[PDB]
């Protein structure tokens, strides 16, 4: 058996270290990796360390441990909500902007605490650990989990045992994402995690600095999937105690708040050396306490956080664009972009708003559609820098013609992207209405529906903008000038 696992992890390492097989082979590669991971997983015992009690049996220990080390533990309780899982619920009225939660640095698990732990010796030898604090945090979490006397046991025993990151999806649940933008990130995440598991399985076997690790005696795929899912769904960037550098950290107690829309209200207080959270809104006694995780897209919430957020006001899709080297004005356009601080080719975002495009994407599209005479006015003379300064401002176009061309282009391109999906928006809504689906399956379908609804909105917005600027052109309206 142990030699069999070594052989299997050896094959898995070579499979997941091979170069990308080509985008049209990525689904086939994905299933091939899945088959190998599941073969290993079925030969292992799940999580190496499990706990006797229910998850909620350990929340009092979490509170008592947080209390002894200076954290806030009054005014909220732990409740298992159907929609979000476990969260915090107010036990008293909490006013907006009230400082209601604080967590001193001693309670955090950080890259720095990883370096000073039993993982320290291996951390100083392995180049992946030194370069990637998120993987370092994951192994820190696993080593302390398997250490019964770890300082952080009261926190670890309250963590989830399973997540809804795509690593946990069934094959047919990921299959819903075929032909989307998001599925490539699902593929990468799965291949990344399998490669890392196999790589570190063998590193732990061969390095003497790993001899004192609990992972030397038991390190399963389920261990690693759990550890990386814990870190990707919960990790945070905080300053170092020095204040001059940033590090990654798990923040007990506060990380039990679930997400709602709003603004970030959690910050780090270096003077008191603690995490501090003020209330995002009034919370009456008996209401769930929410925070705003950040301006992430639903693709990021699904892949990295394991949930889909309905009415995510910050949703977006990618659109890759670049000036073609066969364009005869390539040199001029590249130089205008360079003076504006924009690459010649890049990945931009389309947002679910109006306009759908950022200042940087507007500026790129203006240059992308410029005539030679317009390019020359952005390259020469005493007004050239003034012209570049306004390139990302919707109120000061280059010319009416430039606007009509760029919104025509964006309308055409967004329409073309819609045609590359296997299903239509109307088909996706029918699936969600007429089938009975798992949470994970719904996350997948809503994600692919979301991508198309953003593109459809961009098509409508670009068509509306095209009509607007075509009217200004036909009416010979004076172009606005920044003065």
């Amino acid at each position: 058996s142990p030699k069999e696992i070594l052989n299997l992890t050896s094959e898995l390492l070579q499979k997941c270290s091979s170069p990308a097989p080509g985008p049209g082979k990525e689904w086939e590669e994905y299933v091939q990796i899945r088959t190998l991971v599941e073969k290993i997983r079925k030969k292992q015992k799940g999580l190496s360390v499990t706990f006797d009690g229910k998850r909620e049996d350990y929340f009092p220990d979490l509170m008592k441990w947080a209390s002894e080390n200076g954290a806030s533990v009054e005014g909220f309780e732990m409740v298992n909500f159907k929609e979000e899982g476990f969260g915090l619920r107010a036990t008293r009225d909490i006013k907006a902007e009230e400082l209601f939660l604080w967590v001193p640095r001693k309670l955090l698990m950080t890259v720095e605490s990883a370096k000073n732990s039993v993982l320290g010796p291996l951390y100083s030898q392995d180049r992946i650990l030194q370069a990637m604090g998120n993987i370092a945090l994951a192994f820190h979490l696993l080593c302390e989990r398997a250490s019964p006397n770890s300082f952080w046991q009261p926190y670890i025993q309250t963590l989830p045992s399973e997540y809804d990151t795509p690593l946990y999806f069934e094959e047919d649940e990921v299959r819903y994402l075929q032909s989307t933008q998001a599925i490539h990130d699902v593929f990468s995440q799965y291949k990344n995690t399998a490669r890392q598991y196999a790589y570190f399985y063998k590193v732990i076997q061969t390095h003497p600095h790993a001899n004192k690790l609990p992972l030397k005696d038991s390190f399963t795929y389920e261990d690693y999937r759990w550890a990386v899912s814990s870190v990707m769904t919960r990790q945070n960037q905080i300053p170092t105690e020095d204040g001059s550098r940033v590090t990654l950290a798990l923040i007990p107690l506060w990380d039990m708040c679930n997400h709602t829309n709003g603004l970030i209200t959690t910050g780090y207080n270096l003077e008191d050396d603690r995490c501090e959270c003020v209330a995002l809104q009034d919370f009456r006694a008996g209401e769930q306490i929410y925070i705003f995780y950040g301006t992430r897209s639903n693709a990021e919430f699904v892949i990295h956080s394991g949930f889909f957020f309905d009415n995510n006001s910050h949703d977006r899709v990618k659109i890759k664009l670049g000036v073609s080297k066969s364009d005869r004005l390539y040199a001029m356009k590249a130089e205008v972009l360079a003076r504006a601080g924009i690459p010649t080719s890049s990945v931009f975002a389309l947002h679910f708003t109006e306009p759908p495009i950022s200042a940087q994407l507007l500026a790129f599209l203006r240059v992308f559609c410029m005539t030679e005479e317009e390019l020359k006015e952005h390259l020469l003379g005493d007004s050239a820098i003034d012209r570049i300064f306004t390139l990302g401002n919707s109120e000061f176009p280059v010319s009416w013609d430039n606007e009509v061309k760029l919104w025509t282009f964006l309308e055409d391109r967004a329409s073309l992207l819609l045609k590359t999906y296997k299903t239509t928006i109307e088909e996706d809504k029918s699936v969600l209405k007429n089938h009975d689906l798992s949470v994970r399956a719904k996350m997948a379908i809503k994600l692919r529906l979301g991508e198309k609804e953003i593109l459809e909105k961009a098509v409508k917005s670009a068509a509306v903008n095209r009509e607007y600027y075509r009217q200004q052109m036909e009416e010979k309206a004076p172009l606005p000038k920044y003065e």
Binding site: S17, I128, A131, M132, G133, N134, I135, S188, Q189, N192, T193, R195, Q196, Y199, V228, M232, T233, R234, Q235, N236, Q237, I238, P239, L248, I251, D255, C257, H259, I264, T265, T266, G267, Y268, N269, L270, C275, I291, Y293, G294, R296, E300, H304, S305
Partner: peptide, 19 residues
């Protein structure tokens, strides 16, 4: 505002072969 705003679950790079 907050000198050190904390984004819960900030996205990190996991591609060890890229970086």
């Amino acid at each position: 505002t907050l000198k050190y705003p904390i984004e819960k679950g900030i996205v990190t790079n996991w591609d060890d072969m890229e970086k």
